[PDB]
Write a protein that binds this DNA or RNA. Structure first.
Ligand SMILES: Cc1cc2nc3c(=O)[nH]c(=O)nc-3n(C[C@H](O)[C@H](O)[C@H](O)COP(=O)(O)OP(=O)(O)OC[C@H]3O[C@@H](n4cnc5c(N)ncnc54)[C@H](O)[C@@H]3O)c2cc1C
Length: 456
DNA sequence: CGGCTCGCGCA
DNA sequence: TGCGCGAAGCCGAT
């Protein structure tokens, strides 16, 4: 649908129709940014061809009640900044509260929209809302993958068993799909308060807040400033100060050598494609660059692959057959310890390294990547059953990670507990052939005592 | 058949 | 710390 720097393979039709006479509406969901946003760029291009303005609509759902203030504030502060950015480009934004299935349909009717565009998420609930909207509108409806460098449905047509099978397919398509972004052109044709939504939601969540004994909150909000501008600064300092040592130190949780981009990536406050462009152009240790690109291209995009092609991505049934057979055989094994959700949540296990990982999670909202593996694997080892382990890990990941409620989290938990995108290892009690990680193993790789002391 | 994102013994 | 091996099941290139 027109454009020159616009690859049509990024866009797909959800519903055909007579293009209406009214504005193009971008139903923003996953990609909460004005810059480097293929969904917003395609929306603007369609609007230009039809000689109509583009408007942005965002629907605040009751979903926020299932997480905490830490995510709600991060997201909403981002959106306050986004509202201003879009304003400068003469793009109005509308913030709706309620079920997207109902509210988006109504908005399209009331505002006499000509075309509807949304960004891409493989999570189940987004597909449900889309199907509801389709039944409620008579205008064309498109979806743009603004989150992946290679559109999810282009990179592969099936569930990929392993990174080693996906890697060649993805890297083959980078020359086509890794490109610079055109600038967002302001609107030429002229056309609820977020402050109030924020106060109302916070009041609702205050009773569920994570607290220490003295009733002082556990969460430290100053580690990550929200919004598009801050995200760019974190990217720049990563490339300048941390990228060089990333390959060597990414698996040492006592060193702050990660990008720290995940909260921003999760809410779409920065484009993965932008990050890849800048890292590609940086002159740094080649090994570090390859390690980083493999994480933000292969592992991030295969997580969308996993959720898109396996709608039971958060269930035991999505595990590979060998892992299901192994875990099933060990269901009756005596566990060395059994903890409840509440005991894991409070960091009251016998294992100080596990407890310190959980304390980093509670206090910062971002557990170091290496201890996330250890953390999830011990939940399998010290729970009543594989289903209960899965349920506990997802519950804590999604409640406390700023970057949670994400394909990466479901794929990472499924790797840790069910061997998805892994292979079988030595046979053990309880965990069977699922890859094992030990306290002693961690001791030989990094200064465990220092991580424990940092987080009590 | 070859090669896949641990623990372990050994410089 | 850095290396090379062991223990495991399967994909996919033929
Ligand atoms: C049990 C478990 C739970 C996880 N929970 C989440 C989660 O809720 N949300 C989430 O986005 N990631 C999650 N991760 C994946 C990974 O730990 C985080 O993306 C990463 O630690 C975020 O830190 P960073 O951006 O500073 O990392 P960097 O090392 O700088 O990583 C760069 C980027 O690469 C991608 N990436 C890196 N590691 C992985 C990985 N294992 N899998 C997928 N993509 C990866 C992410 O987009 C990440 O932000 C989880 C992993 C596991 C094993």
């Amino acid at each position: 649908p027109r454009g020159s720097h616009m690859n049509p393979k990024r866009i797909r039709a959800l519903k055909s129709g007579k293009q209406g006479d009214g504005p193009v509406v971008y139903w923003m969901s996953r990609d909460q940014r004005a810059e480097d946003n293929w969904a917003l760029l395609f929306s603007r291009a369609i609007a230009k061809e039809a000689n109509v303005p583009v408007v942005v609509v965002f629907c605040l759902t009751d979903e926020f009640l299932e997480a905490g203030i830490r995510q709600y504030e991060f997201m909403l502060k981002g959106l306050q900044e986004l509202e201003v950015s879009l304003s400068r480009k003469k793009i109005p934004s509308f913030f709706l509260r309620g079920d997207p299935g109902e509210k988006i349909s109504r908005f399209v009717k009331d505002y006499n929209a000509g075309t509807l565009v949304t960004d891409f998420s493989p999570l189940r609930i987004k597909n449900q809302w889309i199907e509801k909207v389709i039944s409620g509108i008579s205008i064309p409806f498109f979806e743009v993958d603004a989150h992946n460098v290679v559109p999810c449905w282009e990179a592969s047509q099936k569930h990929e068993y392993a990174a080693h099978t996906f890697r060649p397919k993805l890297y083959a398509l980078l020359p086509e799909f890794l490109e610079e972004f055109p600038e967002l052109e302001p609107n030429s044709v002229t056309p609820e308060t977020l402050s109030d939504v924020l106060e109302t939601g916070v009041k609702a969540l205050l009773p569920e807040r994570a607290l220490l004994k003295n009733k002082d909150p556990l969460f430290e909000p100053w580690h990550f400033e929200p919004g598009e501008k801050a995200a760019k600064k974190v990217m720049e300092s990563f490339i300048a100060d941390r990228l060089d040592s990333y390959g060597a130190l990414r698996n040492d949780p006592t060193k702050n050598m990660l990008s720290n981009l995940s909260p921003y990536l999760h809410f779409g406050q920065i484009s993965s494609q932008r990050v890849v462009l800048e890292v590609e152009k940086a002159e740094s240790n080649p090994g570090s660059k390859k390690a980083f690109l493999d994480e933000i291209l292969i592992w991030k995009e295969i997580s969308d692959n996993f959720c898109y092609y396996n709608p039971g991505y958060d269930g035991f049934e999505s595990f590979p057959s060998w892992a299901k057979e192994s875990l099933n055989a060990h269901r009756n094994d005596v566990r060395s310890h059994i903890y409840t959700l509440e005991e894991f949540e409070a960091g009251k296990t016998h294992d100080p390294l596990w407890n310190a990982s959980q304390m980093e999670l509670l206090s910062t909202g971002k557990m170091h990547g290496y201890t996330r593996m250890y953390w999830a694997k011990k939940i399998l080892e010290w729970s009543e059953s594989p289903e209960k382990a899965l349920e506990i890990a997802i519950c804590l990941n999604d409640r406390y990670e700023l970057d949670g409620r994400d394909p990466n989290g479901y794929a990472g938990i499924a790797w840790s507990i069910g061997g998805v995108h892994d292979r079988a290892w030595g046979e053990r009690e309880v965990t069977g052939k699922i890859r094992y990680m030990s306290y002693e193993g961690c001791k030989r790789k990094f200064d465990v005592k220092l991580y424990i002391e940092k987080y009590s």
